[PDB]
Design an enzyme around this catalytic site. Structure first.
Site, PDB file in Angstrom:
ATOM      1  N   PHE A 206       0.951  -1.094   0.015  1.00 53.06           N
ATOM      2  CA  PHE A 206      -0.030   0.033   0.017  1.00 53.06           C
ATOM      3  C   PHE A 206       1.004   1.467   0.144  1.00 53.06           C
ATOM      4  O   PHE A 206       0.326   2.576   0.020  1.00 53.06           O
ATOM      5  CB  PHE A 206      -0.823   0.146   1.233  1.00 53.06           C
ATOM      6  CG  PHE A 206      -2.199  -1.073   0.893  1.00 53.06           C
ATOM      7  CD1 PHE A 206      -2.395  -1.712  -0.543  1.00 53.06           C
ATOM      8  CD2 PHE A 206      -3.280  -0.900   1.961  1.00 53.06           C
ATOM      9  CE1 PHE A 206      -3.510  -2.453  -0.553  1.00 53.06           C
ATOM     10  CE2 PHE A 206      -4.375  -1.818   1.815  1.00 53.06           C
ATOM     11  CZ  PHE A 206      -4.475  -2.644   0.314  1.00 53.06           C
TER      12      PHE A 206
ATOM     13  N   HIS B 150       9.761 -14.200  -1.415  1.00 48.32           N
ATOM     14  CA  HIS B 150       9.737 -13.830  -2.895  1.00 48.32           C
ATOM     15  C   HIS B 150      11.150 -14.609  -3.570  1.00 48.32           C
ATOM     16  O   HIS B 150      12.188 -14.299  -3.104  1.00 48.32           O
ATOM     17  CB  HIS B 150      10.090 -12.255  -3.083  1.00 48.32           C
ATOM     18  CG  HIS B 150      10.156 -11.876  -4.637  1.00 48.32           C
ATOM     19  ND1 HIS B 150       9.022 -10.959  -5.132  1.00 48.32           N
ATOM     20  CD2 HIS B 150      10.766 -12.457  -5.617  1.00 48.32           C
ATOM     21  CE1 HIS B 150       9.369 -11.004  -6.379  1.00 48.32           C
ATOM     22  NE2 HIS B 150      10.404 -11.733  -6.706  1.00 48.32           N
TER      23      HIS B 150
ATOM     24  N   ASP C 172      -1.038  -9.512  -4.326  1.00 39.58           N
ATOM     25  CA  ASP C 172       0.056  -8.792  -4.693  1.00 39.58           C
ATOM     26  C   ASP C 172      -0.430  -7.311  -5.353  1.00 39.58           C
ATOM     27  O   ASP C 172       0.594  -6.865  -6.298  1.00 39.58           O
ATOM     28  CB  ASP C 172       1.062  -9.458  -5.616  1.00 39.58           C
ATOM     29  CG  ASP C 172       2.637  -8.951  -5.375  1.00 39.58           C
ATOM     30  OD1 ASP C 172       2.845  -8.490  -4.475  1.00 39.58           O
ATOM     31  OD2 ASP C 172       3.379  -9.000  -6.366  1.00 39.58           O
TER      32      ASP C 172
HETATM   33  C1  LIG Z   1       7.528  -6.059  -4.697  1.00 46.06           C
HETATM   34 AS1  LIG Z   1       8.937  -7.099  -4.899  1.00 46.06          AS
HETATM   35  C2  LIG Z   1      10.743  -6.125  -4.496  1.00 46.06           C
HETATM   36  O1  LIG Z   1       8.706  -8.667  -4.298  1.00 46.06           O
HETATM   37  O2  LIG Z   1       8.914  -7.398  -6.739  1.00 46.06           O
HETATM   38 ZN   LIG Z   2       7.206 -10.330  -4.479  1.00 38.32          ZN
HETATM   39 ZN   LIG Z   3       4.634  -8.756  -3.154  1.00 39.22          ZN
END
Ligand SMILES: C[As](C)(=O)[O-]
Ligand SMILES: [Zn+2]
Ligand SMILES: [Zn+2]
Ligand SMILES: C[As](C)(=O)[O-]
Ligand SMILES: [Cl-]
Length: 451
Positions: free
Chosen positions: A69, A184, A316
């Site tokens: 956000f 991630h 996301d």
């Molecule tokens: C929002 As990202 C740095 O996990 O692509």
């Molecule tokens: Zn990500």
């Molecule tokens: Zn993300």
């Protein structure tokens, strides 16, 4: 705060694998009763207020485990206020915001600060992942685990401080830190090798079609496989975010329920909706990390939602202004808004037989609540918070500049007409959105409470 008994009368309810005609009584902030069947004409169960729901579908509000956000520090893109309003308009009644803000949420003071912003300005219930860095292990150990969903690590995509690449640090976190670790997963070494190939062979002005070739299937799989091994080695609790490939599915299991898994996964609606065939038409408006990849990957991810290899669905949601989305796959920002329309998109796939309504409710509400151990939300049960969404399956909704709520003012769904619309959204028994308009008054909101 709501203090009234409000009857949602004669809806089509979906909850816990069942769809059935019924009514729901709200008493103040909580669900007090579910009444199966069709209440006769004259019968309102002595409600203070009645909303006639004949023809509407009633679900628990979506609980989104991954939004950005942009507050603090990136507020030209979005705020917690602006995007949580967009969220309620999309039937999302709880969100978990990521630590890649400015400053990043990598110390306790910052988390407490975001919780105050939520209290003061959010239109939906709120939570905040704590961020891990190469240098903050001492902060991580001092995290009250009731007050965060878990720890987020960027094993790719991020740069410098937020990129956790230090192998001793990763071993230390997985081996020493007792919380759920959300990752991630993209292997930057592989991305760089690919960038070198494609720049050398095709030049500097690489357009969107190079994006999944650079941020490749193998870059995602290699990172996820390494994270999974490390989690297995330490018996850590690992939650891999935004799966984008068929190949990664082999790392997950569907032989046991989500509650028993040490290693879980999430997929986002854009990976269930778009494929690389859409790059021609939408260009950078569907540039994301991990990249949108093949039609066969989209097909495998849909199957894995149905079979259980994918535990939950999220968005996301990650706004950028359009001036940031301009240029080559090397200059343009990855990420876009989704929360206002992601439920409508999932419901559109249900019209096509891709998912059942029951699965969508499980994946967007029930299982996020179970996986993150969220107290009293995610289910239409007596005693739970009245976070609820009513959708109209025969009132189309066309996405336009005029009705987009995200501060960034665009949507990857711009121009699309969904068969469904959001009719009403309740947050803690407070009507937050009705018939295309946000409420006059902000609903009562709470921090999500974990275990
Ligand atoms: C929002 As990202 C740095 O996990 O692509
Ligand atoms: Zn990500
Ligand atoms: Zn993300
Ligand atoms: C038949 As009636 C008044 O319950 O919609
Ligand atoms: Cl959107």
């Amino acid at each position: 705060s709501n203090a009234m008994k409000i009857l949602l009368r004669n809806a089509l309810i979906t909850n816990e694998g069942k769809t059935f005609p019924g009514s729901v009584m709200i008493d103040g902030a909580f669900i007090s009763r579910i009444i199966e069947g069709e209440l006769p004409a004259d019968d309102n169960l002595s409600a203070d207020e009645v909303i006639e729901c004949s023809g509407l579908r009633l679900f628990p509000g979506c609980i989104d485990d991954q939004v950005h956000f942009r507050e603090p520090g990136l507020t030209h893109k979005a705020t917690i206020a602006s995007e949580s309003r967009a969220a309620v308009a999309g039937g999302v009644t709880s969100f978990m915001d990521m630590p890649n803000t400015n400053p990043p949420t990598t110390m306790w003071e910052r988390l407490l600060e975001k919780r105050q912003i939520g209290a003061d300005t959010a239109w939906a219930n709120y939570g905040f992942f704590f961020g891990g860095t190469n240098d903050n292990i001492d902060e991580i150990k001092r995290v009250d685990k009731h007050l965060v969903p878990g720890l987020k690590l960027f094993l790719g995509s991020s740069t410098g401080n937020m990129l956790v690449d230090n192998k001793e640090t990763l071993e230390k976190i997985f081996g020493e830190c007792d919380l759920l670790i959300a990752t991630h997963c993209e292997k930057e070494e592989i991305i760089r090798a690919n960038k070198e190939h494609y720049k050398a062979k095709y030049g500097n002005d690489l357009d969107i079609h190079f994006h999944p070739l650079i941020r490749s299937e193998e870059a995602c799989y290699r990172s996820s496989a390494e994270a999974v091994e490390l989690a297995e080695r330490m018996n850590a609790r690992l939650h891999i975010l935004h799966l984008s490939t068929e190949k990664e599915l082999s790392l997950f299991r569907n032989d046991i329920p989500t509650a028993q898994k040490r290693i879980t996964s999430e997929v986002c609606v854009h990976h269930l909706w778009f494929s690389d065939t859409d790059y021609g038409r939408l260009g950078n408006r569907i540039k994301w990390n991990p990249a949108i990849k093949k039609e066969s990957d989209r097909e495998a991810l849909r199957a894995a939602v149905r079979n259980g290899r994918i535990d939950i669905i999220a968005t996301d949601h990650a706004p950028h202004l359009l001036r940031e989305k301009e240029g080559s796959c090397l200059q343009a920002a990855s990420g876009g808004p989704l929360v206002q329309h992601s439920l409508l998109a999932l419901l559109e796939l249900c019209n096509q037989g891709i998912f059942s309504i029951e699965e969508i409710v499980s994946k967007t509400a029930h299982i996020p609540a179970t996986l993150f151990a969220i107290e009293k939300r995610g289910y239409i049960r007596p005693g739970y918070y009245a976070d609820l969404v009513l959708v109209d399956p025969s009132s189309p909704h066309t996405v336009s500049a005029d009705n987009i709520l995200s501060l960034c003012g665009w949507s990857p769904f711009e121009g699309f007409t969904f068969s469904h619309s959001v009719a009403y959204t309740f947050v803690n028994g407070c009507l937050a959105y009705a018939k295309g308009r946000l409420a006059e008054s902000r609903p009562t909101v709470h921090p999500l409470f974990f275990n």
